[PDB]
């Protein structure tokens, strides 16, 4: 069922992530581990080599791409500018955090501007809530309709990935599972 999320061709930018449920199927869970192709494999609530219990209703898999040293903001707690304005997973978490390198896939010499991250949001993001709007921020002044002039910031910013960056700045693809029942 998930040779479709861990091997997807074009990944999503973090401010617009693609919540994908998988149900009505026999979930394998044995191809995620016993594979050394992951940089981080951190599963919090339930353990691997035990999750063959009845989570066949609404297993989710949230995928996005973020920079390398921003992988540390996809833990419970761990505030920042990804876990506040882009993707905040809650404190009482049970899924696994999976992240592998994608330097050869998502890097251009001039720079990929298709990937983004939302830098300016009015309030912090709630657990598992997405925002895709493009609204001019109006940080300190009296607000206006939006001309992008002085003190008027564009609410998204690109990464600009490149091949010869540092390992903290190379693009990482993150897939975060989440199990819940009825």
């Amino acid at each position: 069922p998930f040779g479709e999320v861990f091997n997807a061709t074009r990944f999503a930018s973090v401010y617009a992530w693609n919540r994908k449920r998988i149900s009505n199927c026999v979930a394998d869970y044995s191809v995620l581990y016993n594979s050394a192709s992951f940089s981080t494999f951190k599963c919090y609530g339930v353990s691997p080599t035990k999750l063959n219990d009845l989570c066949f209703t609404n297993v989710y898999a949230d995928s996005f791409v973020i920079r390398g040293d921003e992988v540390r903001q996809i833990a419970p707690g761990q505030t920042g500018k990804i876990a506040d304005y882009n993707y905040k997973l809650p404190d009482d978490f049970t899924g696994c955090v999976i992240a592998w390198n994608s330097n050869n896939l998502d890097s251009k010499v001039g720079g990929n501007h298709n990937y983004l991250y939302r830098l300016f949001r009015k309030s912090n993001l709630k657990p598992f809530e997405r925002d895709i709007s493009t609204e001019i921020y109006q940080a300190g002044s009296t607000p206006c309709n939006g001309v992008k002039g002085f003190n008027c910031y564009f609410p998204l910013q690109s990464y600009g990935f490149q091949p010869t960056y540092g390992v903290g700045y190379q693009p990482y693809r993150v897939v975060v599972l989440s199990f819940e029942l009825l």
Partner: antibody, heavy 131, light 109 residues
Framework: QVQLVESGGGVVQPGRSLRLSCAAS????????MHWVRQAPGKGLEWVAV????????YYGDSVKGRFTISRDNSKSTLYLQMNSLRAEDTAVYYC????????????????????????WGQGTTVTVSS | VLTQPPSVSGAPGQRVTISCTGS?????????VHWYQQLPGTAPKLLIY???NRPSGVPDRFSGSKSGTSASLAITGLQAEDEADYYC???????????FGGGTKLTVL
């Protein structure tokens, strides 16, 4: 409103013991690892001990190896440190620091050898050893 | 023990870099370097974690970096309140413990 108030200050003699309690409110204490860190007066920072998710993994510092003992209580949300046979060098300000909720595992085995630092910090018990 | 300079100096508006050199088992083993702001008379606060992630609350002047076995930091446009010390933190698998830096008294002229 996250906070960490810790108690157990005073001036003691070399060759006896002490205990350092540390309350915690506002957050889930029963899921986050917890550290103890101390600071000699005017000098740098040093690390002492750590207590795991439930109380299974305990790693101690290079200096307190054999003299200290760390416990915890998830019933009243309170970390404990037992310093046994205090030398004349254990004078510091003892900080009770919140670790990280990290309790990951791959292929089953849980572990506490992390990267993540200490998010919120205590206030400080200033124990003093003297004669 | 991570090698860190004793004091760095900078006039306001300038850019001061607090270096930190560790061993091959401290930072070069592959554990992240964090930085702390300890004002005198106050418990420290985590300035940067995971070598680049600034938490909610620190301004956009503290950059943070890591290169091999020796991390660093940079403060641009430093003002008259940055009188604090700035330690480091990492892990050492040969010691099975958490290490700290030494202290860098940043003074503003």
């Amino acid at each position: 409103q996250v906070q960490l108030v810790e108690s157990g200050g005073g001036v003691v003699q070399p060759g006896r013991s002490l205990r350092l309690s540390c309350a915690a409110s506002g957050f889930t204490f029963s899921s986050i690892a917890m550290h103890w860190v101390r600071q000699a007066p005017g000098k740098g920072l040093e690390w002492v001990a750590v207590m795991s998710f439930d109380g299974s993994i305990k790693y101690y510092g290079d200096s307190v190896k054999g003299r200290f003992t760390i416990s915890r209580d998830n019933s009243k949300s309170t970390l404990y440190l037992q310093m046994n046979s205090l030398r004349a060098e254990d004078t510091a300000v003892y900080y009770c620091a919140r670790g990280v909720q990290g309790y990951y595992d791959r292929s089953g085995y849980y572990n506490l050898d992390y990267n993540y630092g200490m998010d919120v910090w205590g206030q400080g018990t200033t124990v003093t050893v003297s004669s | 023990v991570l090698t860190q300079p004793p004091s760095v100096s900078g006039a306001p508006g300038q850019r001061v870099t607090i270096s930190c050199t560790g061993s091959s088992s401290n930072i070069g083993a592959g554990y992240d370097v964090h930085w702390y702001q300890q004002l005198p008379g106050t418990a420290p606060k985590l300035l940067i974690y995971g070598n680049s992630n600034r938490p909610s609350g620190v301004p956009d002047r503290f950059s943070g970096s890591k290169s091999g076995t020796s991390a660093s930091l940079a403060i641009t446009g430093l003002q008259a309140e940055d009188e604090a010390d700035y330690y480091c933190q990492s892990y050492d698998s040969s010691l099975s413990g958490w290490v700290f830096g030494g202290g860098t008294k940043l003074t503003v002229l």
